[PDB]
Amino acid sequence: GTFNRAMLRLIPSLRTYAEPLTAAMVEFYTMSQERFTQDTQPHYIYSPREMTRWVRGIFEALRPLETLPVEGLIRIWAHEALRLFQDRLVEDEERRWTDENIDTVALKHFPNIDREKAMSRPILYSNWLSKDYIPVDQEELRDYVKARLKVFYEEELDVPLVLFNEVLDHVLRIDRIFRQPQGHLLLIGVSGAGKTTLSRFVAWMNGLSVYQIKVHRKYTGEDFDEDLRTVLRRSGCKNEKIAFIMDESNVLDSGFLERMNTLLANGEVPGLFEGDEYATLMTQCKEGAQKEGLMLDSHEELYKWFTSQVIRNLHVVFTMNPATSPALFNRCVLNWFGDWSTEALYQVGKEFTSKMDLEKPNYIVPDYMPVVYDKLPQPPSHREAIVNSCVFVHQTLHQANARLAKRGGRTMAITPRHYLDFINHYANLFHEKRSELEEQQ
Amino acid sequence: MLEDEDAWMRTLHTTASNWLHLIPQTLSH
Amino acid sequence: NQMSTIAGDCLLSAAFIAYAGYFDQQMRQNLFTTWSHHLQQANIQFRTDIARTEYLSNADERLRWQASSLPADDLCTENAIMLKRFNRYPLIIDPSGQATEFIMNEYKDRKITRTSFLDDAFRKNLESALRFGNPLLVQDVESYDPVLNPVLNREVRRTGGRVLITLGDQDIDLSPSFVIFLSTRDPTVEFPPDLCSRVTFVNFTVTRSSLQSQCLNEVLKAERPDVDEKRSDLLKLQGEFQLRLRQLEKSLLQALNEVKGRILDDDTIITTLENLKREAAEVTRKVEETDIVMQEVETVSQQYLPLSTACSSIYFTMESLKQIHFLYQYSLQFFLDIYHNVLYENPNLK
Amino acid sequence: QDLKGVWSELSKVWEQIDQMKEQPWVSVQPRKLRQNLDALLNQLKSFPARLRQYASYEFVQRLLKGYMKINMLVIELKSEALKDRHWKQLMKRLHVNWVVSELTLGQIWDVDLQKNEAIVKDVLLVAQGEMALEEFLKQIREVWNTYELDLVNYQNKCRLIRGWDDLFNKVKEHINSVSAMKLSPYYKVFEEDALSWEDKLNRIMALFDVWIDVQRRWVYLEG
Numbered sequence A: 001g002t003f004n005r006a007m008l009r010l011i012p013s014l015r016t017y018a019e020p021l022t023a024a025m026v027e028f029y030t031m032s033q034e035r036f037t038q039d040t041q042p043h044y045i046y047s048p049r050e051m052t053r054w055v056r057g058i059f060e061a062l063r064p065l066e067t068l069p070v071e072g073l074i075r076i077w078a079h080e081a082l083r084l085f086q087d088r089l090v091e092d093e094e095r096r097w098t099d100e101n102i103d104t105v106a107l108k109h110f111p112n113i114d115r116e117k118a119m120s121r122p123i124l125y126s127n128w129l130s131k132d133y134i135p136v137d138q139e140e141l142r143d144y145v146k147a148r149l150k151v152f153y154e155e156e157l158d159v160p161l162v163l164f165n166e167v168l169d170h171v172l173r174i175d176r177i178f179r180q181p182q183g184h185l186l187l188i189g190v191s192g193a194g195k196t197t198l199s200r201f202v203a204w205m206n207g208l209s210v211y212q213i214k215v216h217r218k219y220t221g222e223d224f225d226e227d228l229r230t231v232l233r234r235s236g237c238k239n240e241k242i243a244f245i246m247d248e249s250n251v252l253d254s255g256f257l258e259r260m261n262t263l264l265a266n267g268e269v270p271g272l273f274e275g276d277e278y279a280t281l282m283t284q285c286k287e288g289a290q291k292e293g294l295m296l297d298s299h300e301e302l303y304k305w306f307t308s309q310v311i312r313n314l315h316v317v318f319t320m321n322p323a324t325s326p327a328l329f330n331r332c333v334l335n336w337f338g339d340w341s342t343e344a345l346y347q348v349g350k351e352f353t354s355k356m357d358l359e360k361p362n363y364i365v366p367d368y369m370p371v372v373y374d375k376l377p378q379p380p381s382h383r384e385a386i387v388n389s390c391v392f393v394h395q396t397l398h399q400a401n402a403r404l405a406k407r408g409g410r411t412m413a414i415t416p417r418h419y420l421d422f423i424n425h426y427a428n429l430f431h432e433k434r435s436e437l438e439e440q441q
Numbered sequence B: 001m002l003e004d005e006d007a008w009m010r011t012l013h014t015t016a017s018n019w020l021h022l023i024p025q026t027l028s029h
Numbered sequence C: 001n002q003m004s005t006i007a008g009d010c011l012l013s014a015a016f017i018a019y020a021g022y023f024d025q026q027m028r029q030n031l032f033t034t035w036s037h038h039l040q041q042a043n044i045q046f047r048t049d050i051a052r053t054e055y056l057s058n059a060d061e062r063l064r065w066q067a068s069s070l071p072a073d074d075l076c077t078e079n080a081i082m083l084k085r086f087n088r089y090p091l092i093i094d095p096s097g098q099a100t101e102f103i104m105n106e107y108k109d110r111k112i113t114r115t116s117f118l119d120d121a122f123r124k125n126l127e128s129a130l131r132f133g134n135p136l137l138v139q140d141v142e143s144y145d146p147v148l149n150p151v152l153n154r155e156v157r158r159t160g161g162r163v164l165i166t167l168g169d170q171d172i173d174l175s176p177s178f179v180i181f182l183s184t185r186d187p188t189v190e191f192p193p194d195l196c197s198r199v200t201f202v203n204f205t206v207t208r209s210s211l212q213s214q215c216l217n218e219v220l221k222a223e224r225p226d227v228d229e230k231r232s233d234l235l236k237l238q239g240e241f242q243l244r245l246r247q248l249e250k251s252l253l254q255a256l257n258e259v260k261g262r263i264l265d266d267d268t269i270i271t272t273l274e275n276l277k278r279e280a281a282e283v284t285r286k287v288e289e290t291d292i293v294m295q296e297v298e299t300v301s302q303q304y305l306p307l308s309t310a311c312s313s314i315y316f317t318m319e320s321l322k323q324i325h326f327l328y329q330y331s332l333q334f335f336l337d338i339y340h341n342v343l344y345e346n347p348n349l350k
Numbered sequence D: 001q002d003l004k005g006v007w008s009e010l011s012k013v014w015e016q017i018d019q020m021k022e023q024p025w026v027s028v029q030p031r032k033l034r035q036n037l038d039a040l041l042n043q044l045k046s047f048p049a050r051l052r053q054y055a056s057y058e059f060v061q062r063l064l065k066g067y068m069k070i071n072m073l074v075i076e077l078k079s080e081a082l083k084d085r086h087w088k089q090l091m092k093r094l095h096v097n098w099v100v101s102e103l104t105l106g107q108i109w110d111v112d113l114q115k116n117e118a119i120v121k122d123v124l125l126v127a128q129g130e131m132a133l134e135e136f137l138k139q140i141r142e143v144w145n146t147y148e149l150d151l152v153n154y155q156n157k158c159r160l161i162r163g164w165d166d167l168f169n170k171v172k173e174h175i176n177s178v179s180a181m182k183l184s185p186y187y188k189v190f191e192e193d194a195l196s197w198e199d200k201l202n203r204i205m206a207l208f209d210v211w212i213d214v215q216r217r218w219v220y221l222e223g
């Protein structure tokens, strides 16, 4: 309540909503903490840090805006609730429960409110298409991110990417993290989902400089300390935005993680810069403060400014698969990469099989067609049927692995990388056989 | 098992259920 | 018609390559039958009898494989096809080592280097393979070193004019001619889903069904040579006969190019045409009688199926005998020697 | 009329394209090239639909679209790997008489990069492999020109050599890597240099193979 009053002191029109909003926040937080516990999923940890992140998100969304209606404040409240609570959830029923109870809490604590404006099914926020972090519709976001993916094909990696709904949602989540104060992300999910790809794509898209640790045979803690020195020197002194991406190839060493937690929490690593290193850090911090326009002279104030710059400049992106301390879970904003849904598989198939012919004008649509994509157009075309069959093949591998596990045999995981491999193989084989027959003809 | 792999699960389930039935649940100190 | 059929054929073949490979022979066949049933249910045209080995390979490559140490089995031919048309670096799970020797023989001209994960000099060799562009076969993958994750995932960063890959603490210049074959000799091994995503599995393990099929094929080859020849003709009719027919067509066109006076010097050139026609008729006959020969070979195979099941059961009893006593170590080659003794040099059969 | 107006606009677009083509290859920036090509595409799309139906406008639009498509090959060609020798390979196999100093983006654009994707990709793969070899040789030269023997005082009598394990590991690693280079498919230009380094490496190895031995014995013997 004190924090919300301080936050809403910016907008005199919403001061009377400081007390109710806080209550709503508290209630929802409590509800989630009762509903989701660490016994189900190890990352279902809730603490006052999530509430501080909620307040910080609402503060960052409200700071540049001159005025808001009450519906806008409730909408950003719901948006931050979704980004902090629903994102970590693994199963679908939990996400549905969270989405309904956000509405329930908002109506309970904010009566006489137009819920249509304060709650549309695709609650969406981004300042990519404007100057301020305003709500934005789904279609223009999809168009803008498709254009940026087309750009990202030339610069950096050349392998194609498909922008389906889950990918775009995760892109928006990672962008929100990259625009938060000390916003650190933990992409937890299945292998091959696209965690590294999307993290790097959003980091490039927002201009962040991707830095990754290169551990080796007997990696020394002194080497990790030097890497941290370089990263914080660039983030704080040089005013450079850095996406500090870490993967399980080096996250598995918890000795570095427990030292990373200090930077994740406070935004500084005391004892990292000492002696000569501390003197050079103070010199460069003085130079940077003068360049920005601050004549801070005392070493303590310079260190405070450096810590603030690291808070506002350095973002750490952890990438892991479903050991890790709950403190690390609670320091980072949790995002879940599930296995690609049927719609995602269908979209990937249609995009990656678009250069193929896959068009029979005399295709007779079968009665009672076996359909795996519920939203598949009826009546389907030949290409639609082919992509449906591809999705069915992936689903049959999943069912086969489930049956083998039930019988007691050893099974391997079918990641979305298997589906991408299958579609690439289909393209190569189709083109090869067509070329062979055409030259024969 | 290793001689013929395919029946073993159901038999083991029944055997373990019977063993749980015979073996007393708790022993008092 | 083959235009009409290629879409379904390639869908099934690509699914087989990408998805099957860890499963046993019956499980691959079940997956293929499920996919074929779905494609038929959706009126997606495909050939009813997809011979995967002959669709995804030609006679020249199969003969070259047989020149190498690739056993002439359906499972091994399918596994070699997966080892050929792979987009992800394969993980070989042979328990015997024939597949590793096959890989070494195939890439001997490319200077393939055999390394192990247990070797302390592994990483260094890997760096060389990454930098100088040489095939590398790394064994003992059950102790997989996660440092290979960027290499298997092909995560490259194109800084400057040099393409890099992060191996350990060092950024190695990836070479276009690099290929790595992971391998293991442990059939009962579990891999993390990360590695499962970065590699494609190629299982050479001999199971009950694989050995049953091997024994059935050997019975058919030994005791019913005519039925074995007819079955081989079915497999060859999936393109090999047409391949040689079109090769003779090309030869006839080449001979018909040189036509100036010598076309009617004897006016008996028609012989070559007759030859093609004859073979055409032959293959046409083999096309017309395909269903009858399929039924015949299936009945003959059902005749010797119980013997094949008996052979599989006998071998797996032999293999499991090691639990009774440590001396009871009997290899598959030992059972095959027993079985060839029973088949060929059996004085009772005389 | 409408035809005269579309001819004038076509001439303007052709002049812009020519100004783009006259840019020398040395200063061609592929990113800004893509941005300006997109700007020209937007200029083309701004024309009225009646003028867009003309065949010449469609030809120029698809030509600019193909230029945008081969822009990726433009980034790939404007690399440090391509050197002069690989440019000479493109010179020979494309059968065009270019001048490297006088090379401009227009000459490369006139050559059908889309039709010659196989040639360019093969040359670029050769460049990638050979640049990998060249940078490994650069690493060898750097390390073996800046590497110093570690000396530690020994009972105020002499400065003995410490760090035998590190030095031997480095020498063995470099010898093995040069031997592997000798098996590389791109080991044609870097042959002689590699040979020379191999010789030096062997000598280094050989020398220290006796040096440590002598040192050890001497230490023991003085004790």
Ligand SMILES: Nc1ncnc2c1ncn2[C@@H]1O[C@H](COP(=O)(O)OP(=O)(O)NP(=O)(O)O)[C@@H](O)[C@H]1O
Binding pocket: A159, A160, A161, A162, A163, A164, A167, A190, A191, A192, A193, A194, A195, A196, A197, A198, A247, A319, A320, A321, A348, A417, A420, C153, C194, C197
């Ligand atoms: N939306 C997408 N469309 C197409 N390909 C994609 C997409 N997302 C990811 N990929 C592909 O996924 C492959 C590798 O997956 P990656 O992005 O490394 O997933 P990850 O979650 O980092 N896997 P891991 O590190 O093993 O947990 C790449 O070749 C990407 O091209």
Ligand SMILES: [Mg+2]
Binding pocket: A195, A196, A247, A319
């Ligand atoms: Mg990753």
